């Protein structure tokens, strides 16, 4: 279904490196409809939570600490295959595997700095989704390119 | 002072055609600073105070029904003259006036979907910020960048 | 009103050097709607008529054999204000008189070589667009955007 | 050889999100030379015809429908090896196998509003080339820059 | 005549900043002809010569100590009008009073870090050009585009 | 290690065709500091040097005649991995093979006219780096941004 949604982030390092707006034009130009939006500063806590999956690994510490340094912008992007899509304009987690063409692929040299976050999966999108942003903070609304973005 | 403050919008027209991130992009480029980021469906009463200076004009209640129509995004920015500096980005009110280079000489052709807001003075972006962000959604924060855009 | 139309077209020197695409992306960009687009090389006839106002002028063959030197991309561009709006596009007919931002200021240099055209007024605009389009060539359609673009629709 | 030729189109719904001056400069800047261009709308009946070898595919009445439904803008494009190159430029035919860098990467999202068409082959191209184009509508002409592009030349 | 020749430098906070090749694709989209450049340190006799005309004015030993801090890119351009057209893809000396479209409007807030210099007369061009440019690292070539760019 | 560097050259077809300042952008976009730079002719000789392991190729004597027929420009580009990843930025030696977002995949179709070289290992980069530059020709100077491009 068109209406997946997934949460992307740009990074403390993409907020310091002016990548916000650059980042954010790649996901509108694609088609996919932005829900959500905002500027924040996480807490050490949150960032542990957000990357609870890798708490035994030994970069551990220094993500939790990096990511909970200076804002980030979170967002919520909807559509078809969005998880995946989502990935896909993001590039692969160590920028040196990375494309030309993808933001890390594009932006970014270090894995410690790739500049941005996406969701990897449907189930975990929700959950971070549900983690970052409040339902109030969520906005339904229709695109008025929708028929020219999906065929059905 | 560098600690200037205003507040964007880019308008329901500006979300819809898809300029959300060409605009932060602008502001990012020239060397000020995001501060608050928020994406939200203005109510009708929302729209009526921003816009409360043009109770009086003709063409108020279309403004206030459109700016309430759909999601708009809500920025703060600062920099040093970034009231003035926000204005010249965005050009011209009507975009009949506004000149290749600005946002609405690039992207618009109509005074009443002209894609975007500013504040017009020091004392109406302070008023906008405290109507629009509640003080914990700014966030502060030094640029990397500080000691190369300013001399000072 | 918004079904106002002008003739704009990359001359040939903007097809050589690669601005055909940048300066139909600037139009699209501003929100006006694309009614008419070909490629042809005009014959030198067909120049002297298009420039016929400027006969008198010292730069007036060399205008001539220039345009007709190889192919133009010939354009019909719809919307409110489209004959002032695309001329505030293109920029100054000198490019040294025009900034950055417009066409001309971006990607040009000499008045000669300016890259591009626009009709000079609502009248001459109808004029050129039926000089260069038979009315079968024109496309009539509504752009999905068009609600978003203008109050009044 | 270099003389190679392809058709490109934009489709209705490229057309219809300002994709037309994007998709011409990625062409433009990669090397290859503009030789026939126009906007035209499309009948079913063409439609059909130009996608014939798909009749017998589920999805083919929506598409010749789409096809038909507004304008399209129709290239043709010569150069080295342009008919795999076009297709390279265009990305794969479902956008969500697309990769970031190509048309349909950076621009669509579903395998029925994919944006573009571009001929599989160059028997297929000469065929599409024919089918929408008259042979006094493509322009030969002799880019200022083949000597820049292309060794042998 | 279209051998006019000017000097422009990305000066200190450009560099850093990254400005070096969006200041250069913009004086080749122009159509103007890149004859000289190079990366290098200035010293600080360099910059107080350079500046010699400014050296009683109050900012003096600031933008000489500026412009000695760090890697310029020096460049030669070549074109008709080159001088004038340079300065007008500049933009005005205070980035507060450039407009969108050129380099100091688009990408600079201060008069103290204003990314960029252009020679301001044919006069202080050659000047320039003989005091950063070794005859050795001019190139003399002809671009293929030159009857594409000028009618003569 | 951060220190790695690698020779980046803007072929004459490059330079003939604008875009030394796009290629440019790009490295500069990746996070990659430039550290030389220049504009020159390379003599024959040069060429036949630069390219001593094709000298057995049947190309050989066009490619040098080419790569001597007027200005490159030449670069040294400093970071992690940086000589794989000028590569990557490359693309494909025939841009018949190079992907969209890569410089040959975007602006290139003929594997002799094929807008730029990299250096193929740490190796061949100190060679050439060595052969086209002085000593006293790079910048040494450290980025403002390294802490936001490297965790270490
Ligand atoms: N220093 C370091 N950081 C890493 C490494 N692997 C991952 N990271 C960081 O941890 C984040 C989360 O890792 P992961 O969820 O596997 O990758 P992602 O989903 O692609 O971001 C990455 O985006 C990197 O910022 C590593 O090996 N070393
Ligand atoms: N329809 C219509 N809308 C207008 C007119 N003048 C202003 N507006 C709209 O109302 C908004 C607020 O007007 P104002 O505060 O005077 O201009 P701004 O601060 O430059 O945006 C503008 O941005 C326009 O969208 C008008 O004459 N007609
Ligand atoms: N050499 C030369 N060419 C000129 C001069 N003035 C105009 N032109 C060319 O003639 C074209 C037509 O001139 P005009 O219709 O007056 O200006 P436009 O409507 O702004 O294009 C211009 O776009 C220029 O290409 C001139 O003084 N010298
Ligand atoms: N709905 C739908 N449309 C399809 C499918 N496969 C192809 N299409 C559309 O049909 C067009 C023609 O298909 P084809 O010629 O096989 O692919 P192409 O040459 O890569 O464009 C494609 O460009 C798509 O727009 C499908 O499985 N479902
Ligand atoms: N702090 C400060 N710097 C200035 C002032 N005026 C000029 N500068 C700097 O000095 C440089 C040289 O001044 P000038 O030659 O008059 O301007 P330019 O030719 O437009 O750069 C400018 O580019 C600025 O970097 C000023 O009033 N204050
Ligand atoms: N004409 C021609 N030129 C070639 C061929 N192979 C390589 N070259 C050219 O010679 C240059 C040097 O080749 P090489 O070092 O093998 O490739 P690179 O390091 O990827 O540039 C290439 O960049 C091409 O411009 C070929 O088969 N034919
Ligand atoms: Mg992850
Ligand atoms: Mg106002
Ligand atoms: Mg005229
Ligand atoms: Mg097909
Ligand atoms: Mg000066
Ligand atoms: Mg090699």
Redesign the interface.
């Given at each position: 279904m068109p209406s997946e949604r997934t949460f992307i982030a740009v990074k403390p390092?993409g907020?310091?490196?002016?990548?916000?707006?650059?980042?954010?034009?790649?996901?509108?130009?694609?088609?996919?409809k932005?829900?959500?939006?905002?500027?924040?500063?996480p807490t050490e806590e949150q960032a542990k939570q957000h990357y609870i999956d890798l708490a035994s690994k030994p970069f551990y510490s220094?993500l939790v600490s990096?990511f909970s340094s200076?804002?980030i912008?979170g967002m919520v992007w909807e559509?078809?295959?969005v998880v995946?899509?989502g990935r896909?304009?993001l590039?692969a987690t160590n920028p040196?595997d990375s494309?030309?063409?993808?933001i890390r692929?594009?932006?970014?040299?270090?894995?410690?700095?790739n500049v941005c976050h996406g969701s990897d999966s449907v189930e975990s999108a929700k959950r971070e989704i549900a983690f970052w942003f409040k339902a109030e903070?969520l906005?339904s609304?229709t695109?008025?390119?929708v028929?020219?973005?999906?065929?059905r």
């Open positions: 390092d907020v310091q490196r002016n990548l916000v707006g650059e980042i954010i034009k790649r996901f509108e130009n694609k088609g996919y932005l829900v959500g939006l905002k500027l924040l500063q220094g990096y200076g804002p912008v559509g078809l295959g995946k899509g896909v304009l590039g040196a494309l030309p063409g993808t692929g594009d932006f970014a040299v270090d894995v410690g700095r903070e906005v609304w695109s008025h390119s028929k020219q973005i999906y065929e």
